[PDB]
Swiss-Prot record, chain A:
Transmembrane segments: none annotated. It comes from Bacteroides phage crAss001 (Bacteroides phage PhiCrAss001). Keywords: Viral tail protein, Virion. The keyword ATP-binding does not apply. Its main location: virion. GO terms for cellular component: virus tail. This is Ring protein 1. The barrel is composed of five stacked dodecameric ring structures. Podoviridae-like phages usually possess only one such ring. The tail is thus rather long. The keyword Protein biosynthesis does not apply. Forms the tail multi-ring barrel with ring protein 2, ring protein 3 and ring protein 4. It is found in: Virion.
From Swiss-Prot, chain D:
Displays an HK-97-like fold with an insertion domain that protrudes at the capsid surface. It is found in: Virion. Disulfide bonds: none annotated. This is Major capsid protein. Capsid protein self-assembles to form an icosahedral capsid, with a T=9 symmetry, about 77 nm in diameter. Each asymmetric capsid nonamer is covered by 9 capsid auxiliary protein, 1 copy of the trimeric head fiber protein and 2 copies of the dimeric head fiber protein. The chain holds residues 253 to 303 of 504 of the full protein. Interacts with the auxiliary capsid protein (via FD region). Interacts with the head fiber dimeric protein. Interacts with the head fiber trimeric protein. Interacts with the portal vertex auxiliary protein. It comes from Bacteroides phage crAss001.
Amino acid sequence: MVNNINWVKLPVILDRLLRHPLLTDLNLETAIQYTLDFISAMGLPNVYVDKIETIDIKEYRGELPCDLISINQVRLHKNGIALRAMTDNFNAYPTHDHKGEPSFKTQGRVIFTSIKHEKVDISYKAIMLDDEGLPLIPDNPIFLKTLELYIKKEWFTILFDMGKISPAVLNNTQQEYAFKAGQCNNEFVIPSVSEMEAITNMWNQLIPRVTEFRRGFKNLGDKEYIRVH
Amino acid sequence: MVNNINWVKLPVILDRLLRHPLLTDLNLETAIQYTLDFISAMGLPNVYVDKIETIDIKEYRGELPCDLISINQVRLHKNGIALRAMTDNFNAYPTHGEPSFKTQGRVIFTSIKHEKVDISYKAIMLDDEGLPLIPDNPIFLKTLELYIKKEWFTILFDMGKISPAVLNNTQQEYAFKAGQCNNEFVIPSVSEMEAITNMWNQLIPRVTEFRRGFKNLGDKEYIRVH
Amino acid sequence: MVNNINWVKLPVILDRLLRHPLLTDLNLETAIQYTLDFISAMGLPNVYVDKIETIDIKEYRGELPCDLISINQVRLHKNGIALRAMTDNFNAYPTHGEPSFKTQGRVIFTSIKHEKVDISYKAIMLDDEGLPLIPDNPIFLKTLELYIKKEWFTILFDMGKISPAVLNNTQQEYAFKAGQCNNEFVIPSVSEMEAITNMWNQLIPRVTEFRRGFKNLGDKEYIRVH
Amino acid sequence: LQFDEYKNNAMAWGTSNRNLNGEYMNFGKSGNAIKTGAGIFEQTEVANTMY
């Protein structure tokens, strides 16, 4: 992302929506759901906050944090060795012989690892919250314009099923959302001048680096210097 | 899947649906069935809780657990060899190889007479009540809302209570959000792309992962320096 | 099939149909025919139950069981040699080889005079009553709900009680779920692909799996090291 | 002298730990089954034994 993600509270989005006299019965309760339906559908990873937490595995099981949404990487606390993913169908289940590589698996508020008794560090992503327990949205007026249009798109769809909006008004709102929801995708994704140096070092390599996942993706963007002979 | 499956209850889908003043006569009873149509039509494998359970094969047959939906694998208990699939037509029937299984109902027909086998299967995650638990992921919840909206608006359209351009917009909004939700639950994460990076990139191919529990499928293949 | 076939009775499809108030004149008598027409139209071999029965052949003729629908194989009870098909036009008929079979009604016409044969056949699974028993699988139920809806709306459209746009939606809503229920019940599982993987990848190909009861079909073909 | 006393006394006095269900249950320090065979004084006492 090129810009910085400054945080503003949710009543900024109702400065803009209630400028339209057809959307004046929007509420904070209606704006809380339509913001979270939007943030998840757009899926821009720069909207979430990066958190690191150490949890302890009891018996191939650990208790996962409350505010988690998605895990970037799990590692081991003693080695720093990262864990990949459990492809095993038969993880902690022993044969009657009562009988290699760390891996993990996450479903709910539980993590299923291939290690028995060890501490693991989990680098995850959460929603950034307010003083209130509400989501805190970015300041970028491409994001705020396309969030304004999304809430306007789902409200006008409800009026069109009732029959209180002509079909050319929804068809224009579905069109104007469709461009700004792509323009918001291109804004939050396209790398910076600082972030294109981290891709210039990864892409240009005389001797290829194919084990960055074993580290914490730390040297993914590091310059591969070559001695002169 | 990138995100995690944080579970929420079935009345969560009616906070979202009863916002619509045309869908105000939907119940929890109707939300139960239209959820079960939606889990099975999508068929995403992240919504199923992965359980493992041992049975006892009595005479080429054993019972199956009460909450089974789909078997991942069946393996032997003492050896550990996974049972492939029954291709035979005459399994338990004698006249005058590699083991195999075939499960139809609450019974599993194996090719072994008196043994124990571990079954790794999938169930529906239940609640404190006996009701299915849904993910709170708002790509899933939005298109589950639109499935219950589309199947209700179909009913109104046959009675003549909905404009033909209103169901056409709801069928359009579902058909995007059903393919968007599909891709949300099936695109691999960074942690699961390493299990594909180590499987795909192999100088010496590993083509016998099924004899194991697909355990070493994501293992990196290291080659010595000589 | 990735899933399993858990059985429910016929009137579960009438819990689902009579949510639509233009179908609330259906019975259990009407659900029996339009399901048996449906189950046969999909032709899914996972819905039928596999039974094996030894019969005896009298003189190039034998008695066939009462619940049969489709024979997988017929083999000899003493040898295990399966029977191919009767291409002979003149089977028992003398003038002045490889064993074969031909089954028209309740009679099986074989080319062996006085023997006992094993017939692996497929039957319908039934209830406490003598009524067919459908899968609980909510893709099968959603398209059996749409099949009886499509055949009821056809009668109404011929009576002129349903607009063309209402039937054209039900003809289309069925036409998609008819392919999805086909693909739900046909696409192989992680366990049935190993019947295919060990069969496709062969260095010395096996071409005589019909003499066995297709038993060694998905067996892995191992090569020695030298 | 002690390792050969292990090698003689296991050849002479070795009792097979296979149960009648064909599964061993004496498990080692990592968890796997200890598989022990029959010695010279157990393999002679199966056919013509007396007391």
